[PDB]
DNA sequence: TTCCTATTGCGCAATCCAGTT
DNA sequence: AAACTGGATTGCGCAATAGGA
């Protein structure tokens, strides 16, 4: 059954390559969402800043 | 020389360990961040909402 | 148990990158 | 400039071992 070794390896080195490739991609995606969230975020910081300037104007 | 080689190996194996851990790292860091981000952004929309009604109402 | 794949840590070699001689 | 260092990164296979029919 050492006659299985190799065949099994390759069967493995391919499963590896796959897993990894997957991972890397899942990061990218995750990585990406960070930028999407940082977009929303500043959007809000500025927005809030705005409303604030507003009541600060209005009231005081 | 030989050990010449085996030591340059030793060296690299470590740079490799280090560098791989720093990446395991960054990869988490990001996870964490994608969280504080989701939370932050979210408590920020609720602040805009809150801050707004305070305006509709402080107007007429 | 029994097979397969999936995932992980690890080492080799080739590069890549800077700061050097 | 042009080869030269020496760590950092990265593609790649190996082996152990987690998982889930």
DSSP line for A11-55: HHHHHHHHHHHHHHHHHHHHHHHHHHHHHHHHHHHHHHHHHHHHH
Number of domains present in the structure of chain B? 1
How would you label A1-11 residue by residue, b for 16+ Cβ within 10 Å and e otherwise? Answer: eeeeeeeeeee
Q: Which two tokens stand for residue A17?
A: 């390559």
Write out the residue range of the structural domain in which residue A11 sits: 1-60
* Experimental approach: X-ray
CATH code for position B29: 1.20.5.170
Residue B58 main-chain phi, psi, to 5 deg? -90, 25
Q: Resolution of the deposited coordinates, in angstroms?
A: 2.8
Q: How many C-beta neighbours within 10 Å does residue A33 have?
A: 15
* Cα B44 to Cα A44: distance, rounded to the nearest angstrom: 6
Q: Which one of B31, B34, B41 has the shortest CB-CB distance to A40?
A: B41
Residues 24-53 of A with CB within 7 A of strand C: none
Give B40's Cβ-side CA count (13 Å radius): 17
């Amino acid at each position: 059954n050492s006659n299985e070794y190799r065949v099994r390896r390759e069967r493995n080195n391919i499963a590896v390559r796959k897993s990894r490739d997957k991972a890397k991609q899942r990061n990218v995606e995750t990585q990406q969402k960070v930028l999407e969230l940082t977009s929303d975020n500043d959007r809000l910081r500025k927005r809030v800043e705005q409303l604030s300037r507003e009541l600060d104007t209005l009231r005081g």
